[PDB]
Design a protein around this ligand. Structure first.
Ligand SMILES: CCCCCCCCCCCCC/C=C/[C@H](O)[C@H](N)CO
Ligand SMILES: CCCCCCCCCCCCC/C=C/[C@H](O)[C@H](N)CO
Lengths: 242, 273, 225, 225, 273, 242, 49, 67
């Protein structure tokens, strides 16, 4: 016989190893496939669709989860109140867990590419006003005033003739990839802070409601890339499945 | 090397090494507007542009995938037309409603009668939703199409009891049914992820209408219309409509639907359910 | 940056635990020396959450059968595997006629040998596996007692899997089997939302009604991080 | 005379001991049946002195896992390996959900089988591993209690490694694991002096202040050999 | 054979056999003067020739390695110029001093202000040291550049205590800090091996000046200027200066530095530390 | 199946054996590399740079290690005093342990090629004089006088107009390679003795110090070659690393 | 010798696996066949009567 | 493949596979009257024809086999 040499690693099973096994049904011919709509060959196509991002999350809204989908806006008596603020990291515990982007991002460790956040105005047609949506690069805290937040990337948008605004989050990083940023020592990977600010005011005529709700959407772009698959925290077994 | 494998019916090619005569035992390898349909017509001037579900138009079943030896009927005018349903009165605490296709039209018109006399069913659908409001009304509706929508059960709230939803909830009929916990959609799945499937937003400040064209999606070319429900329709008031005192409090929601490219087979006796 | 990692080929292909089967010496269940296990892959939570991304799925499966004693040690015990297609006789005992292996595939392996590997083609009569089936498999009326058939796709039951120890006498050593699966040659359709609620039952997606877990964490104020 | 021997290819490529992990039956630590070991290669002195020649280093690693009982003998015991990337669940027990091996790689080997070998690519998000990092990973002020973050490169923590014995019951035999690494496909930069002082701590190059060892031997007179 | 490997980004080729689809799982195989910068200028007639660190000149970041989508600022005149620091009085028992770049210029000039408003930082540096002496003075200075200079701690001298150096020693600022045990450089490494890195000798009988051009060296193209210190600067009086009585006992040491090819990105708020 | 034949050496692990293992991350794509200065593909480039050689090593200087880097020179009242002497073997315990050449040479057993030793004059500019730096081939002891040491390879150098001198140590050997010379039986591999001698005198004007220090440097040449990697004595574990 | 690598599934017997075994009668020449009526190469011909 | 084998001195050829350098360690393979002599004479008229043993006549030793 042919002389053979055994090496370490024999008689082991690697779960990620792609091998060739023995068929139990010689020449088995399955059913011929048909044309089924919606063929998805890559998980990126699911990350590129706009999904609802929940900006408002409170301990008082745990009884009514439906209030998580939007945040209120009304008439202000002062200048430059902070409407909302949230982290820009999709793989961090927080608002990004509601979108399909963060859920599929938790399967992976290192992520890269630029993202986008879309706001939707559900208010009345005759209610006008303007908002200032700013993005602060890493290293900044929650800006105290509007003069502090404007120092970064911001956008100005109107209520009346447009129903949506898209804030493109640019890719600003020291490394080509970002691991998921967690508490403490892992804050080095934080993407930034997305703050929305009152620019002018919420103006409403007589006969229309003075309180409106804004729906926030979030998705990825064509340059978005992930790698290094892993387990997530979003499924748990405390008991057997009956 | 015979071709028995599962990936040999697609248009993508893969490289793989195989030491046996079966290809499924091999390894993985390198990876690489006015719409007039039939006798009825509609004109929507306030509506957003038509959203084609999964970018495919409904079409007749080709002879390549067709496993039936019978020659099907195509009653173009008596089957495919706009069918208007009952209106749903909106309220501030309204949780939303859902319909099960094609169970709604089983009792209505020629489509419903031929569906009882035929065992095999394939058609495409046309979804249209109508909600009217004035300039003083602020609200948002989410109209989405989820294929294979399965109803869950709270199991009494404890979780130790095994119970299934009855035929009234799983088969609401023409009138439809109302959601209980819209957050999980009674599927145990988040509402924020519903937009992954084909959807359209109805915002009362801009578009008061919605149109979605959903083709036939199943693992089989033909299937029984009575038992199998293809997809559901969800109209969910995400943003509650707000209006001050003195405004009209009755806001209807009208849903009209139409079949597209219907083919029936297996002419048989009268079968209700 | 390459997209090969986020593709469905590498994400769906690897080993996972779809089944846990035991044959204890003392107990009320498997102590007869054999086990008859109907095939269900949804008793396991985490791989189920991966397969629920998509409605229709077409693929092939490679299996790995690991055998060990419940305490973790091993004994020179010979085991027999057999696959029972629908309609084939299910074994009533260890000496039963069904284990005689005439036309049914079988695998022979010891406990000192490496785990057994087999390749299972696509055996479903349809074009792809249907995970969530909306409708009823049966005709006629359905009452409250017949509501069990809801969410049941007849194309998803492909057979029954069984194990036993060889020989007429009872084996003194207990055996615990762990079934593994690697998905390959996969095709996918119809993406779905990912379930945010804990699992309860295998056959249907029931959720606990008393507590609905929010998909996102909560904080004290919207303006404070 | 060929220079192939003094090249960095042959000098960096071979096996060395980066970790020592034990699972005793009686004791206060690993007796629960499992071990959670954060990955650190600097607990070993002599290979550390080889890697400190250079600041930035880019390479691949091949591993060898040797299992034996602390007295040196062997028993037919089945073991399970798993790699936990950052963010992945760390096991809280031996029956814990994390060991179920859904998307996380795993290796199965016995104690009678030859040692297991795996290949680890370059997983760092940067261009190369940074051994000595001058700065802080965190923003804001740093007080005396927060000084622990000094000399910590966030790119150097690539995950956590864990081992356990299969089965629900506790295994009566103790297990000692010795982790090995072979560096291959190596690229190097920025030479550094070789440390002449004994090691103290893993995370930072502390030296004992009372006695400073001279790098050269001493004699009585400069003019006498 | 896809190209996933670690050695496939270099200019050297290797031969290797691989039985799998990943190249990282394969085997090893066969192995194969007057300087005017910006608004400031200097003329050194007593200085030795310029020593280029690692034989590379500082240059702008190419688009191949650049991962940032922002367009960076290049304030050529207000950033890159000679910056003179404080003078260090030499004494016979002086153990030497060390500075941490780029932490020295963070408080000085336009370079320091734009560094606080920008998250990403890349630049090259110019190191220059000045020590004056007469013909009756005999001494030698060692000016070396050690990338990634990490400060150690004596751990109380026993070795059983875990302690880290505070921010005052790790970030000395513009004034700098003094060495404790110059033999180990507080790195635990010999002083005799310091010349492996780019270095220049200042001998008071010949050259009273030193010039070293150090480019940007990091595993990342851009990095935060505040936290990360690139390299340190060591001026070590190896040979103690000796002079008889009556000679001038005050010998200053002047260190002037300049940035080269600076690029800033990520305009943000004011961040001190 | 194909007939196979097992040979001795199966189921063994050789630490120096270069094998091929199974990947745990199929098709994993690392981070694209950038251009990092100072790429070193061979350990010879580190051995060719001048590093400080400590000629003066005494038991009295153990408290002040800084005095090891240089040796004093002053005015002499006699003819031909021996300033310093040291072994020429880089892999022997002694002065050569301070240089990076000897440290990297301890990783290897057999070494070959010619070396070089550089002296640096840190004295005053107006102080003049001359030195005799000689190299004795193997077999000679420490020369008693200057007439004995001159019989080998020597060099003459001046203080005033030159700040450095380089003594090239030629390769004189019976064998193509030299193993490290240790005490007793291993003295057969000794390279030689490098002695520095006072040639004329140390002349200094009035007003300048009469005592100067000389720094010694050591490195290798292009013909320097090493082989047979091994463990060194310079790292020890008497306890675990906490 | 040639370096070899063992994979899971060694030392097992699959009843449907089609292998190659060792002959017990080297070069054994059976009896030459004759023409027998009714040769059936497929089970479908029996199902069609 | 040196020729050391035992069957390599005959006129018949065989096919064999060998994994070593010696051919004897390989496998088997496919298999493929009046007589006057000197000063004396005899005449046999009643005798049957001469029977040559093994069909070969006695002959002198050739130089090929002669040691
Ligand atoms: C030699 C023994 C071979 C044993 C073969 C057992 C066949 C198991 C095939 C599993 C592949 C998926 C089959 C169906 C999976 C889920 O359980 C179904 N959706 C059930 O609803
Ligand atoms: C199937 C089990 C595989 C286990 C894989 C474990 C990964 C270990 C990779 C080691 C390669 C070097 C990683 C870092 C080394 C040093 O500890 C870091 N510098 C820590 O500072």
């Amino acid at each position: 016989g042919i002389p053979t040499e055994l090496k370490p690693g024999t008689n082991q099973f690697l779960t990620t190893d792609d091998g060739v096994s023995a068929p139990i049904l010689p020449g088995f011919h399955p059913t011929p496939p048909i044309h089924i709509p919606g063929e998805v060959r890559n998980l990126l196509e699911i990350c590129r669709v706009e999904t609802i991002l929940e900006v408002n999350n409170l301990k008082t809204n745990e009884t009514t989860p439906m209030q998580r989908l939007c945040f209120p806006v009304s008439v202000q008596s002062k200048t430059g109140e902070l409407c909302a603020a949230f982290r820009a990291d999709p793989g961090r515990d927080g608002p990004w867990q509601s979108t399909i982007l963060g859920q599929l991002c938790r399967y992976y460790t290192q992520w890269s590419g630029s993202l986008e956040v879309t706001f939707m105005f559900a208010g009345s047609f005759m209610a006008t006003g303007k908002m200032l949506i700013a993005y602060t690069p890493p290293g900044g805290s929650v800006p105290a005033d509007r003069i502090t937040a404007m120092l970064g990337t911001h956008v100005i948008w109107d209520f009346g003739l447009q129903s949506s605004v898209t804030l493109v989050v640019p890719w600003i990083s020291n490394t080509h990839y970002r691991a998921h940023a967690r508490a403490g020592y892992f804050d080095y990977y934080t993407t930034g802070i997305i703050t929305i600010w009152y620019q002018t005011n919420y103006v409403v005529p007589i006969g229309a409601p003075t309180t409106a709700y804004i729906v926030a959407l979030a998705a990825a772009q064509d340059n978005f890339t992930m790698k290094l698959c892993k387990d997530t925290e979003d499924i748990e077994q405390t008991a057997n499945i009956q | 090397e015979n071709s028995n494998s599962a990936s040999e019916g697609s248009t993508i090619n893969y490289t793989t090494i195989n030491y046996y005569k079966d290809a499924y035992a091999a390894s993985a390898g390198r990876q690489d507007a006015q719409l007039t349909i039939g006798n009825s017509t509609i004109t929507t001037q306030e509506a957003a542009n038509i959203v084609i579900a999964y970018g495919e138009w409904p079409e007749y079943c080709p002879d390549t995938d067709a496993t039936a030896v019978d020659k099907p009927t195509r009653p173009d005018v008596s089957v495919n037309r706009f069918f208007t349903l009952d209106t749903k009165s909106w309220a501030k605490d309204s949780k939303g409603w859902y319909w099960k296709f094609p169970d709604v039209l089983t009792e209505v018109g020629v489509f419903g009668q031929n569906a009882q006399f035929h065992y095999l069913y394939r058609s495409g659908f046309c979804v249209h939703v109508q909600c009217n409001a004035s300039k003083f009304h602020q609200g948002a509706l989410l109209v989405a199409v989820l294929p294979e929508y399965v109803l869950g059960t709270i199991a009494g709230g404890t979780g130790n009891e095994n119970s299934h939803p009855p035929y009234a909830t799983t088969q609401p009929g023409q009138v439809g049914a109302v959601l209980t916990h819209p957050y999980v959609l009674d599927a145990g799945i988040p509402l924020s992820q519903l937009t992954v499937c084909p959807h359209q937003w109805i915002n009362l400040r801009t578009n008061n209408c919605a149109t979605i064209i959903v083709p036939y999606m199943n693992t089989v070319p033909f299937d029984s219309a009575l038992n199998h429900c293809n997809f559901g329709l969800l109209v969910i008031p995400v943003v509650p409509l707000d209006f001050n005192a003195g405004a009209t409090s009755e806001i209807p929601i009208t849903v009209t639907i139409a079949p597209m490219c219907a083919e029936f087979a297996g002419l048989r006796q009268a079968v209700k359910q | 940056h390459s997209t090969q990692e986020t593709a469905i080929g590498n994400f769906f292909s690897r080993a996972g635990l779809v089944s846990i089967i035991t044959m204890p010496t003392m107990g009320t269940q498997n102590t007869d020396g054999y086990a008859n296990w109907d095939i269900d892959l949804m008793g396991y939570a985490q791989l189920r959450r991966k397969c629920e991304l998509f409605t229709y799925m077409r693929f092939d499966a490679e299996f790995t059968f690991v055998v060990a004693k419940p305490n973790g040690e091993l004994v020179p015990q010979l085991l027999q595997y057999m696959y029972v297609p629908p309609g084939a006789p299910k074994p009533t005992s260890r000496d039963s006629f069904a284990w005689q292996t005439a036309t049914n595939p079988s695998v022979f392996v010891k406990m000192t040998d490496p785990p057994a590997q087999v390749s299972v083609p696509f055996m479903s009569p349809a074009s792809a596996y249907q995970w969530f089936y909306d409708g009823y498999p049966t005709f006629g009326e359905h009452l409250q007692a017949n509501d069990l058939d809801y969410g049941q796709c007849p194309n998803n039951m492909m057979g029954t899997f069984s194990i036993r120890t060889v020989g007429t006498k009872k084996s003194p050593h207990s055996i615990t089997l762990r079934v593994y699966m690697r998905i390959k040659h996969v095709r996918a359709w119809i993406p779905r939302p990912l379930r945010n609620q804990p699992y309860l039952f295998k056959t249907n997606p029931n959720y606990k009604g008393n507590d609905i877990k929010c998909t996102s964490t909560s904080r004290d104020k919207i303006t404070t991080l």
